[PDB]
Symmetry: D3
């Protein structure tokens, strides 16, 4: 039984994130989205991920605390899957990947997000949305709905 953990704050989840979830879900038996304790509270973040991943029956959403590698090992896996996008601090991701292999033997697999979703990030989406800009093509509809409510 193989399994990947996709860790993050997901505040909010973007279509870049969902693209990675989909690719992980297609290559591993189970995928766990670990929401790592912002604009939205924990329960909203969970809801937004769930609502955006109903098409992925082997995907599961869970709150995580502490080291990602602890979460991974407790849940019975040894793989982390993370996306790459424009603006990713890859050097820091690499540093963490090597540290995570060192302390817990967990591998990290990096996958590039699709070009169309390669420039969205949670932070930039929020900042642009707060200043009036339309990022709805870059976020799941469950997120757009909640984003709209707050702006109103």
């Amino acid at each position: 039984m193989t399994g990947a953990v996709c860790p993050g704050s997901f505040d909010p989840v973007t279509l870049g994130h969902v693209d990675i979830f989909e690719r992980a879900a297609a290559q591993f038996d189970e995928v766990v989205v670990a929401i790592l304790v912002g604009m939205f509270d924990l329960d909203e973040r969970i809801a937004m991920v769930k609502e955006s991943t109903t098409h992925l029956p082997n995907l599961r959403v869970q709150v995580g605390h502490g080291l990602v590698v602890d979460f991974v090992r407790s849940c019975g896996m040894t793989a982390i899957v993370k996306g790459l996008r424009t603006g990713t601090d890859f050097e820091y991701e690499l540093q963490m990947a090597q540290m995570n292999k060192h302390i817990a033997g967990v591998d990290t697999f990096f996958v590039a997000t699709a070009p169309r979703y390669s420039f969205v990030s949670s932070s930039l989406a929020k900042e642009v949305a707060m200043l009036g800009g339309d990022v709805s093509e870059l976020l799941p509809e469950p997120v757009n709905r909640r984003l709209r409510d707050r702006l109103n």
Copy 2:
């Protein structure tokens, strides 16, 4: 009628900035320096840019608020011009450039600052100036004057 916006906080403007202003002014009909709301207050920042750009008759200085692309489109342009220097977070600039094209159709043109001004930044100039170091060859004289006054 073509036009470029050069956006930034300009706290203070450096000769790296002025180098870019000069290159934009030579290639576009109008250049607008948008001061985006630090050490110097808004009026000082404006004054320092104006005083340092008297040799650029098609350049105009204006305070901006909100999204740069909104500023650009309201002022009747669709081009942003930004400089590159050592320490520029280019991946983040790229992310913003793609986001800005997405939401408003605005293009961003990047130009490398001259080598002699390639290692000055507003932040580093301030920090070095506060700790006693001489950065006067890297800043316009209007900035040096104001910088000197505060240190005294």
Copy 3:
């Protein structure tokens, strides 16, 4: 009168190139595509660029020889416009940009290609096309037609 030169081998021109041509054409009075002396011969390359740029009335195609900056200065301009894509050797582009400013005072403006065209290059398109892969969504139809003929 402002003018940009877009230099390259264009063997063949891609939709990444055309994206840059379009953005240059919208910001400068004249754009000259300089085809710098492969799979297609010079006349085919010229034809493919012309056929792919009929919607750009201020764009002009010309063969170039020697230094780009010489071409730029002889044609009455001082700006080069180049695109950035995934796999661009940007450090080398920067080196050339600084060298070109040094020897001839010519500025180079870099613009990111649209995400959807950010992973095509002339070389990779050819290599993929030769090994059977379908890159037709990444190239102008004038190029696809000629590409098809040779493969047959």
Copy 4:
């Protein structure tokens, strides 16, 4: 049934490669090492990979021709797994990864090699070995044996 292809020339295979093979083999049901048509001939390359991977029962070695994505799809998989090391041209790997997703829907997962094997590459190992240097701690013993024979 999940499966990863690890493509390359493997001329010769290094312990950096074997590190990646091991991590792929632990996360996928099947791993296929595709030797993509140098110093060693095809049969030696195959032999060296086989001899260095006897501890990986779900790993299989095969010669490949043409597009990696064709190989992947014909063999019934949709994942490529590639390692990262110091000197990897990651921008080009990213370009190929996006092109490969475009033409065939195949995902590419990148994993960092262990630090101790992060500076070996086939090319550098050969060049150093030819000029007298000892790289035996960076290569499998099956490779060292064959490397020694040729130098003698």
Copy 5:
């Protein structure tokens, strides 16, 4: 008489730092570790560096204030030696190196830390140690001892 300054906050010193100290100590007549004013207080930081460098008789530990280049010049040297690791912001280090040469004529020499210590940093070690992870193989024993005490 030649001399290198190795500046930093060293909160705490890591084996990556000690690796660089050792390489500097072997190439310069004197090495000064400048602790630049966190988790540990100044006196603990000093103690931890001293205790970890007893094998380096030409190495000296000193608190520093203000510009590194001022410290360097006052102490009778003109060289800074800094390490590189995974996650180093090298572009910012380069910017500072050029600024430091500009204002004070001081050269900065960069050396890569050993691969085995290439993913430790003071910040990441602390964060991992606080969340329960074992980083003891990446830190001097004098640091491990003090780290253990606080966690208990």
Copy 6:
């Protein structure tokens, strides 16, 4: 007795190279410029380095063959000093630096060339000089003289 080797092809030596030689010569007891076996023949390359370094009495020029680390160790040193400029393939330099430490225990120190000489390289200088461009401000006069002769 401390010593640095500055290895390269130096075809021809540039003022970027001489800048690095000067900084090495000021920090080490002896500097050996190792010319590693182009446009100029070995004897011209030697002559050009010598003629450009008469102001550096502790600098010595020598032809080298094989591994740089062999040269370094035979000459009684354990340090390599290399410059960084715009267009340097730093990832490959890092790979070689780690390989060189591995096989022979030799450290490599990297130093940034001055901004004014940061965009010259032997290759680009030659190519620009062949196509008519004036790079004389970027090369020693001994090189300019020889460069002029060949062009005539």
